[PDB]
Design a protein around this nucleic acid. Structure first.
Lengths: 71, 193, 49, 61, 145, 41
RNA sequence: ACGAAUCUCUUUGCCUUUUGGCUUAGAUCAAGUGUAGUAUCUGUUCUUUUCAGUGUAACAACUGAAAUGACCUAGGCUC
């Protein structure tokens, strides 16, 4: 039971600085500094001769999956 | 109220997710219908993520991409439960829709075999007989086949030690073992899972 | 033992006369399939046998 | 040869020669025996079968 | 399982055919999932391979016919070895010359003539016409050579 | 009113099928029993 | 009779940690024997009137055989 997150401001009112301690992070280094503005005897011999659904697991894509990777 | 009911509600959610994974229907008898439809909507959303992540990670394992050993192992567990759910849905539909074979196809299949066996004048296999001198030859081969699994193994759990004790009993008193087999072939029709 | 004997939801009572006509009917349509028949009788499989 | 009629739970084995000697336990005449004394004659062959073939608890009592 | 039990009665004692049928109707368990196997062969049975070859015997006899399967098997008193015929007149009697089935895969050798070869194609292109000439697309062949 | 959650999988420290046979199953076994009796005669 | 308080009691309504979470149910693993003998629950059975023998410390238990009708107020020199 987490039951509540941490409100940000209890970090933000801490008196290290307005800034952090003075740690310089690599992702906070400068970059992208310029903003961009928009302007027949053999045949007779035998006996038997002559949708998109909204569910993952009941789909056609899923049963072709389980037919290939469970062999 | 906000505090007392809340822990109870999240216990039904975790329980509704253990039921989806076990492929068991989740029915709480006196639960209100709008609380039931929120838990069902959110269990289906989690299940949608769970399935598509299993497909995504199974295709990485196929194409040779490097996957962790813990994540290869978690993938086989998901794809076992997904495989059984397709297998239970296949069984439920054959009960519901009936057999795919028609009665005219089953008659034709049955007579092709009778015509062949008449043509071969086949003498059909009897029951394992009362006076059969070869009975002990068949037992040696079957018991050795079962025994060779244990030729290598070092550490056995309780099921493997129980398995070897029955085979050593069948060597030590082969005539009582052979009578147990005949009693089962005549009478035993319900089996263990 | 829980699934086959000791679950109190199981049905071990005497069969009525309409259960026996249901049992002889099913045992002829599904010759030896005793776990499928017991699902339909809603009784344990060993009792049906 | 197999089933017949016997105690298939207390004996460590039952032999083919055990069919001959005991044979009252193998027989199936459940009621209408012959007035007590043969109820006594069966229990003696029950005692001798449990001593010879029975497990340790059945033998010992 | 109803069809198995009937076909198995023709070759074995009915107490064996009842046991073998009833043994496939079992509960399957994986941790907390359960169902009854109501349909299909469980291959982890020790006699599962016996059922599987007798069941595949049916399909061989439906593919060959009674007439041609007798040619390949030989007479019942004096049978053939594998790929052995009693004569060449028996060998050339039918366009199917060789048959084998390794478990689930089948192998058939056919030898035709222009007469017998065209008759078959004529009947096929009558009932499956192809004026667009697209039969070459999706014809499986061996990509390793 | 919310019922109390009681799980089959986990226990807290404190406070410790309807459908009938399809007729295709009925009609398959009648056909296979006629072909069996007709063949054995 | 009633306005009416206060103590006792029931019914109705209220109501309490009526699971700390998550994943590959996270995973796996589990009971020696033999020979003599005691103690301790439970179910089950005692349908009998005299006498004789056996038996006992006395009983009991066991083995044998055979008793009913009349009247008066527990009882009968009753038949």
């Amino acid at each position: 039971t987490s039951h509540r997150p941490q409100l940000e401001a209890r970090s933000g009112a801490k008196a290290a600085a307005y800034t952090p301690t003075g740690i310089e992070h690599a992702r906070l280094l400068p970059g992208h500094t310029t903003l961009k503005y928009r302007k027949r005897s053999w045949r007779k011999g035998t006996a038997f001769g002559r949708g998109y659904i909204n569910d993952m697991t009941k789909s056609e894509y899923h049963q072709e999956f389980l037919h290939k990777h469970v062999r | 109220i906000r505090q007392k009911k809340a822990r109870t509600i999240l216990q039904h959610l975790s329980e509704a997710w253990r039921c989806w994974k076990a492929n068991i229907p989740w029915d709480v008898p006196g639960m209100p219908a709008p609380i039931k439809k929120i838990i069902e909507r959110y269990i289906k959303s989690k299940a949608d993520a769970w399935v598509s992540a299993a497909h995504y990670n199974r295709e990485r394992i196929k194409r040779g991409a490097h996957v962790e050993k813990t994540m290869v192992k978690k993938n086989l567990g998901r794809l076992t439960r997904l495989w059984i759910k397709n297998e239970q849905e296949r069984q439920r539909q054959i009960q519901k829709n009936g057999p795919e074979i028609t009665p005219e196809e089953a008659t034709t299949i049955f007579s092709v075999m009778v015509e062949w066996l008449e043509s071969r004048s086949f003498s059909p296999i009897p029951f394992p007989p009362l006076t059969y001198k070869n009975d002990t030859k068949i037992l040696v081969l079957a018991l050795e086949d079962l025994k060779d699994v244990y030729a290598s193994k070092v550490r056995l759990n309780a099921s493997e030690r129980e398995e070897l004790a029955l085979i050593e009993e069948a060597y030590d008193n082969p005539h009582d073992t052979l009578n147990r087999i005949k009693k089962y072939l005549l009478t035993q029709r319900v089996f263990k899972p | 033992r829980w699934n086959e004997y000791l679950n109190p939801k199981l049905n071990f009572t005497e069969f009525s006369k309409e259960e026996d006509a249901q049992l002889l009917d099913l045992a002829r349509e599904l010759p030896n399939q005793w776990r499928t028949i017991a699902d339909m009788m809603a009784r344990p499989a060993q009792v049906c046998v | 040869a197999l089933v017949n009629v016997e105690g298939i739970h207390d004996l460590m084995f039952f032999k083919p020669s055990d069919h001959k000697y005991f044979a009252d336990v193998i027989s199936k005449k459940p009621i209408d025996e012959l007035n007590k004394d043969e109820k006594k004659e069966r229990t003696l062959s029950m005692l001798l079968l449990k001593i010879k073939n029975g497990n340790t608890a059945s033998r010992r009592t | 399982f109803t069809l198995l039990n009937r076909l198995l009665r023709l070759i074995v004692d009915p107490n064996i055919a009842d046991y073998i049928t009833a043994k496939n109707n079992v509960v399957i368990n994986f941790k907390d999932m359960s169902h009854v196997n109501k349909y299909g062969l469980i291959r982890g049975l020790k006699f599962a391979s016996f059922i599987f070859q007798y069941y595949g015997l049916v399909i061989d006899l439906l593919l060959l016919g009674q007439e041609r399967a007798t040619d390949l098997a030989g007479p019942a008193n004096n049978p053939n070895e594998f790929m052995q015929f009693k004569s060449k007149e028996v060998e050339k009697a039918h366009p199917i010359r060789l048959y084998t089935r390794y478990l689930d895969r089948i192998y058939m050798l056919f030898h035709f003539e222009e007469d017998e070869g065209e008759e078959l194609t004529d009947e096929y292109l009558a009932e499956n016409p192809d004026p667009n000439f697209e039969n070459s697309i999706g014809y499986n062949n061996r990509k390793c050579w | 009113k919310i019922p109390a959650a009681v799980s089959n999988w986990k226990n807290p420290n404190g406070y410790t099928e309807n459908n009938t046979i399809n007729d295709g199953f009925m009609k398959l076994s009648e056909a296979l029993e006629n072909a069996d009796k007709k063949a054995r005669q």
